[PDB]
Amino acid sequence: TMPRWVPLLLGLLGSTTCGMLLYAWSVFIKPLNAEFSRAEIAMAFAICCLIFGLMTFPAGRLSDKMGPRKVVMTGGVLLAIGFILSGFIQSKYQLYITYGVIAGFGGGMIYLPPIATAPKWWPDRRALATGFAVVGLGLGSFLMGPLATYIIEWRYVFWYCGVAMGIMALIAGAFLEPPPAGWKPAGYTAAPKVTRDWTYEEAKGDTKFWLLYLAYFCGSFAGLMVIGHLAGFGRDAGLTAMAAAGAVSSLAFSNAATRILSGWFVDKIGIRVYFAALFALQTAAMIAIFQLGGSVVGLSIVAIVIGWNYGAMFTLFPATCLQFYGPTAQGSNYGLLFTACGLAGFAGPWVGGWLKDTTGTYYLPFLCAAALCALGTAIVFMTKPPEKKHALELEVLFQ
Numbered sequence: 001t002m003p004r005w006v007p008l009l010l011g012l013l014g015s016t017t018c019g020m021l022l023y024a025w026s027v028f029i030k031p032l033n034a035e036f037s038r039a040e041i042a043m044a045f046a047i048c049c050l051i052f053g054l055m056t057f058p059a060g061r062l063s064d065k066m067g068p069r070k071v072v073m074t075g076g077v078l079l080a081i082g083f084i085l086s087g088f089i090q091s092k093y094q095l096y097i098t099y100g101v102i103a104g105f106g107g108g109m110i111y112l113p114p115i116a117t118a119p120k121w122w123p124d125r126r127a128l129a130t131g132f133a134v135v136g137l138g139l140g141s142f143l144m145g146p147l148a149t150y151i152i153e154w155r156y157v158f159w160y161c162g163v164a165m166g167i168m169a170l171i172a173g174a175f176l177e178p179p180p181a182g183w184k185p186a187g188y189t190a191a192p193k194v195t196r197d198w199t200y201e202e203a204k205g206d207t208k209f210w211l212l213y214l215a216y217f218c219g220s221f222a223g224l225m226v227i228g229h230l231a232g233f234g235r236d237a238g239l240t241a242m243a244a245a246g247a248v249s250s251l252a253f254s255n256a257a258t259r260i261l262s263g264w265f266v267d268k269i270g271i272r273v274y275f276a277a278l279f280a281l282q283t284a285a286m287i288a289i290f291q292l293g294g295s296v297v298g299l300s301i302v303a304i305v306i307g308w309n310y311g312a313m314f315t316l317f318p319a320t321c322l323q324f325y326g327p328t329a330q331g332s333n334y335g336l337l338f339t340a341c342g343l344a345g346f347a348g349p350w351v352g353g354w355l356k357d358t359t360g361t362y363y364l365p366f367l368c369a370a371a372l373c374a375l376g377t378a379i380v381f382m383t384k385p386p387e388k389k390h391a392l393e394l395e396v397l398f399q
């Protein structure tokens with residue numbers, strides 16, 4: 001076999017590729033305007049989020065059916081193709097297709113299968129393993145942004161980064177597969193009562209799946225609706241652009257770190273209460289920005305918290321889903337669940353911009369984000385796991 005820490009490395013690789021994909025548009029804003037609108041460019045990012053978040057669902061299903069390796073490597077090919085084709089674009093729709101759909105398609109197919117597979121190697125520590133599958137989305141900015149910046153002084157970014165990302169994803173998918181069906185990597189641990197994981201049709205039909213879905217949409221939407229406004233709130237309060245941006249930049253560090261730390265923490269003490277507390281904290285942050293946000297230090301504290309809570313979602317929801325329905329159907333269960341996040345990624349940033357511009361003030365978007373997080377707090381706290389499924393058909397084998 002292989003040392004079970006390898007899948008952690010693989011998910012790190014794949015998730016880092018996905019982070020580079022989701023971060024690239026920000027480095028591409030100014031070049032594309034110079035040759036030819038920020039909103040026009042941004043529609044490419046929103047299309048990308050939509051396709052990514054939707055394509056996790058087919059990616060999860062196909063991973064569950066025909067294994068995760070084929071899925072991630074196809075995704076690597078699709079992403080490499082789409083990104084690389086963005087270099088040859090000559091119009092806006094060219095970019096919508098190359099980056100928004102092909103690259104988003106490949107990205108979703110890379111993102112999901114490791115998220116499902118890594119915990120299968122770590123039943124003693126499921127949430128930490130998941131965090132390794134999702135931590136790369138924090139890092140992509142750090143490795144790439146400097147490198148992508150180094151290149152333009154822009155098409156070279158698309159082509160060369162597309163190649164490097166394809167290589168990383170193909171390597172990640174090349175070595176990815178669940179443990180052997182029978183023997184689970186361990187060092188430790190009349191007629192019985194045999195339980196079993198949930199089927200995708202059973203999980204999909206469960207009411208708690210959709211409470212979790214709703215909560216996922218709410219939190220995803222809140223964060224995505226206000227994060228882009230953090231620095232503007234600062235500058236609006238009287239800070240220099242340099243100061244405001246410096247402050248908001250701490251968010252990336254917390255968004256990356258929480259993914260591992262929260263995973264480890266709930267592995268140790270359980271999920272529900274920590275998770276609900278994070279949502280509450282996010283709620284309070286949406287409100288508190290109106291008192292802290294006018295100073296580099298205050299604005300930084302809010303950005304760090306917003307980042308901490310936001311990022312935690314992408315470990316804790318898959319971990320929660322794993323607790324409720326088990327790992328055998330996790331490709332399907334969590335892929336369906338992640339589509340909420342695909343939708344929020346599509347609409348949330350736009351809606352936040354619209355509310356601010358509509359009122360000219362930040363009260364509306366931050367208050368709406370606070371309410372969404374409040375509902376999420378409620379759902380996450382109130383929702384306890386369903387009853388473990390009885391496998392009467394294996395139960396009857398005991399004579």
Ligand SMILES: O=C(O)c1ccc2ccccc2c1O
Pocket residue numbers: 049050052053134137311314341342344345346
């Ligand atoms: O944080 C992440 O891991 C992540 C991954 C994929 C996403 C797709 C659409 C919108 C937000 C996403 C997101 O926040």
